[PDB]
Design a protein around this ligand. Structure first.
Ligand SMILES: [Mg+2]
Ligand SMILES: [Mg+2]
Ligand SMILES: [Mg+2]
Ligand SMILES: [Mg+2]
Ligand SMILES: [Mg+2]
Ligand SMILES: [Mg+2]
Ligand SMILES: [Mg+2]
Ligand SMILES: [Mg+2]
Ligand SMILES: [Mg+2]
Ligand SMILES: [Mg+2]
Ligand SMILES: [Mg+2]
Ligand SMILES: [Mg+2]
Ligand SMILES: [Mg+2]
Ligand SMILES: [Mg+2]
Ligand SMILES: [Mg+2]
Ligand SMILES: [Mg+2]
Ligand SMILES: [Mg+2]
Ligand SMILES: [Mg+2]
Ligand SMILES: [Mg+2]
Ligand SMILES: [Mg+2]
Lengths: 117, 64, 144, 201
RNA sequence: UAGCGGCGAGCGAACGGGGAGCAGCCCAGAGCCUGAAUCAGUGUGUGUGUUAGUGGAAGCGUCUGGAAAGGCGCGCGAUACAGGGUGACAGCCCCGUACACAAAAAUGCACAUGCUGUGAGCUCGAUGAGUAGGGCGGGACACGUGGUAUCCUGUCUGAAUAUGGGGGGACCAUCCUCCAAGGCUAAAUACUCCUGACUGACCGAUAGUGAACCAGUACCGUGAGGGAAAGGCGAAAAGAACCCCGGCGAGGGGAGUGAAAAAGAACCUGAAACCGUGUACGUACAAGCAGUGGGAGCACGCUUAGGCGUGUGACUGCGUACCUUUUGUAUAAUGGGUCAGCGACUUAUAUUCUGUAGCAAGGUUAACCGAAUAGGGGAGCCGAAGGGAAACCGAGUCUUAACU
């Protein structure tokens, strides 16, 4: 016969109020933040992690297109050479070879340049 | 206590060998029956299906 | 033998389990999950006994005349039992256990129904072919 | 059959004490839950009426005065007073059918076999009103604070059991399973009283 | 249900049945006998209650702690372990407690009595006139004049008188039942300013009484009237001698009290908003819901590197709060400054489905009784038969003259 809301009352606010970052002004100090902002965070987060898979790919190719072309054949022709193979197909990501194993990479551009029929 | 709607009683109170209390029939009788002969035989009553459910609530203990 | 490793373990009661399913819609209120509202949630009939749309009219059409049989009910005497809890004097008036007329009444008339006699000075004023031909293993009688 | 080894007594007995149903919780659980709501001739829920000290009808001027929209004051929102859908004394007491009442009770004997189903005597030699040396008799089975209740059926001087909560008498027809199951080993006892359909103790 | 009802809304019986309770008597009058039962007011007594009360059991030790009722060891009372209180929770410390006693007096009710009044009992009698009916107007009967019986009547009339008079729902006959105009009568129902005892799946200082506190106070009003805020040091005041700064201030710092003063009187626990001091990092050429994704550096922390944890975040892709209300929904439609507590499908009886349990062509009792959740009680409710508007018939029955 006792709601005595006080009992979870606190725990709930405290829960979301637990936004370490503090963000700014009311965004931590006032409960107002939670479903307004802590909620946005959940939303902005929901999409960015999955939308990110590509944002890096866009970078991966951005550099491959910037590395492979300097030594003949553009990114457009590159993957096409690479495309022809029985086993020769190791995708990008590691494609950053242009930063650590340049010799490999340029030795990989021939795997495509000389590969393009 | 649940009060049966005394009206429907007088109306279709019954309960054949399996509920489905046989309402009743007749139309224009005792107003305009100076029309049609064949299509007007009191026959007997009958119940329904799509509508039975609504007419169900009255009765409880077999009364009359 | 009782083990002194400190706890009994006999079998008395404590309790006796339970009877069926259904012991609370979850009412007594509404508060908690689902945030009930009741007053069925819309905003029409709120406090009960608001049988808006009286059952009468629209259901209340056509109402044949009628009367009443002043016969108390003239119970049939019964399921073709006469004679045997029927005082075995076969006639019939009232002090019976298995099948009884219940007394307040005018006349009887028995149908034939369940299992019949083996002995039976059937009276009861009464009748039926169900009667004359099933109770007939014994004692006709009808009188008036 | 046998009611296990009996201490001090030759043995126990072979009475019907109901067909000997198994249990079917559902049933008893209901009578039980239903039992914790019998002597309820009434129950407080004092604090009520949505018409608290309503010494007045709305005096706050509706349109204007800035934020407003007040009215009456038994107003369920006004900290002042007014408790909403109030409350009430009610009945509580649900009633269990007659047959459902006797259904499945002393399932004790079989299940609680190695515990409860003892039958001896109501202790006849007990002093006029003496509970002190109850222990002497409380040891004929070694069942004491373990709880247990007797069912002798004689409002004699054996109603002597008075303690924080151990032995209860109620030795009489009047007795519900709720109690029989509240104790470790309900000493049926009584003897012969435990007949077939009337195994009532 | 019957019935009443703009036959609207709605109003709503009784006969009859099951129980609680259970008794009938006076005057309308004389005589015989003759103060006789019956009551009433009063003085008295006895029972049994009310008003003060009396007796009422059985525990030590050691541990922790300021404090023992608590832990652990053993021990005793129990017709008493309801409860309260005592320096933390006690059957055995105190009040009580079951049980067992008790009243000069004063009264409640009972019985009994005396006094006063009453008047029993037998015989033979008498038997409630402006009344019953009725015309007009109304009201009461579940009955709204309806065909409306019956009851009371404002107003005006007005009889028979027991081989007579009323009633039996217009009214008449028959039959049945009962005597009106005079009166008395034991055996329940309602409410709470207050009384004592007791209880609570009732609140616990924004609650619960407006009021836990010198509250109907302070206040406010010409007034009637309205009507607050406001609890907690500690076990113990042991409420801080004395010293020092200071205005012989405030305030504080020591010392001492204390288990604690990180209990100092603003005194339990002391959160949030809000306001500061300190430290690590970012930051004075850079535009916007201030984050999110990426991310170097820096401060610490890493590890027998191993590529990490915490803080901060330059630079950079994105990218207009929540609510409400709206077609508008990022919407510039609604709702919400934030937090904490409270805030809305319940409850009763009835009816019907589903699951489950009991029993089975049978199932089940209601009130009530009660050696109260038993057992008893089957009044009654439902089902095993239906058809017809019904009488009526009946595994048939209506329909029709029909047997189809
Ligand atoms: Mg809450
Ligand atoms: Mg990158
Ligand atoms: Mg059938
Ligand atoms: Mg919703
Ligand atoms: Mg709603
Ligand atoms: Mg609605
Ligand atoms: Mg709608
Ligand atoms: Mg309408
Ligand atoms: Mg208002
Ligand atoms: Mg008394
Ligand atoms: Mg305690
Ligand atoms: Mg406050
Ligand atoms: Mg102290
Ligand atoms: Mg710095
Ligand atoms: Mg971490
Ligand atoms: Mg803006
Ligand atoms: Mg709006
Ligand atoms: Mg819309
Ligand atoms: Mg008993
Ligand atoms: Mg009987």
């Amino acid at each position: 016969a006792r709601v005595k809301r006080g009992v979870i009352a606190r725990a709930r606010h405290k829960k979301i109020l637990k936004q370490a970052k503090g963000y700014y002004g009311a965004r931590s100090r006032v409960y107002r933040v939670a479903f307004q902002a802590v909620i946005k965070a959940g939303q902005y987060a929901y999409r960015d992690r999955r939308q990110r898979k590509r944002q890096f790919r866009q970078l991966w190719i951005a550099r491959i297109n910037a590395a492979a072309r300097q030594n003949g054949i553009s990114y457009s022709k590159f993957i096409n050479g690479l495309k022809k193979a029985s086993v020769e197909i190791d995708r990008k990501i590691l494609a950053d070879i242009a930063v650590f194993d340049k010799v490999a990479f340029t030795a990989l551009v021939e795997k495509a340049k000389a590969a393009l029929a | 206590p649940k009060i049966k709607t005394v009206r429907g009683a007088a109306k279709r109170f019954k309960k054949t060998g399996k509920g489905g209390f046989k309402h009743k029939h007749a139309n224009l009788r005792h107003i305009l029956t100076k029309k049609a002969t064949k299509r007007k035989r009191h026959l007997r009553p009958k119940a329904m299906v799509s509508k039975g459910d609504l007419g169900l609530v009255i009765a409880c203990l077999p009364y009359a | 033998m009782r083990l002194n490793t400190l706890s009994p373990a006999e079998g008395s009661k404590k309790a006796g389990k339970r009877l069926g399913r259904g012991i609370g819609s979850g009412l007594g209120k509404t508060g908690g999950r689902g945030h009930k509202g009741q007053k069925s949630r819309s905003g029409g009939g709120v406090r009960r006994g608001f049988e808006g749309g009286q059952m009468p009219l629209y259901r209340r059409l056509p109402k044949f005349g009628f009367t009443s049989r002043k016969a108390a009910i003239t119970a049939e005497i019964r399921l073709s039992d006469l004679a045997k809890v029927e005082g075995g004097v076969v006639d019939l008036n009232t002090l019976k256990a298995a099948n009884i007329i219940g007394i307040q009444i005018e006349f009887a008339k028995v149908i034939l129904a369940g299992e019949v006699t083996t002995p039976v000075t059937v009276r009861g004023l009464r009748v039926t072919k169900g009667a004359r031909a099933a109770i007939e293993a014994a004692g006709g009688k009808i009188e008036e | 059959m046998e009611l296990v080894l009996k201490d001090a007594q030759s043995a126990l007995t072979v009475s019907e004490t109901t067909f000997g149903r198994d249990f079917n919780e559902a049933l008893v659980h209901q009578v039980v839950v239903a039992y914790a709501a019998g002597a309820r001739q009434g129950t407080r829920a004092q604090k009520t009426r949505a018409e608290v000290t309503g010494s007045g009808k709305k005096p706050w001027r509706q349109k204007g005065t800035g934020r407003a929209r007040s009215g009456s004051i038994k107003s369920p929102i006004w900290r002042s007073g007014g408790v909403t859908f109030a409350a009430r004394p009610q009945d509580h007491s649900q009633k269990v059918n007659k047959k459902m009442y006797r259904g499945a009770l002393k399932s004790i004997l079989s299940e609680l076999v190695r515990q409860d189903r003892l039958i001896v005597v109501e202790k006849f030699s007990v002093e006029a009103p003496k509970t002190k040396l109850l222990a002497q008799k409380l040891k004929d089975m070694a069942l004491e604070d373990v709880l247990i209740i007797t069912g002798e059926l004689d409002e004699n001087l054996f109603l002597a059991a008075r303690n924080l909560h151990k032995v209860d008498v109620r030795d009489a027809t009047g007795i519900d399973p709720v109690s029989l199951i509240a104790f470790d080993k309900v000493v049926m006892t009584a003897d012969a009283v435990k007949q077939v359909e009337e195994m009532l103790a």
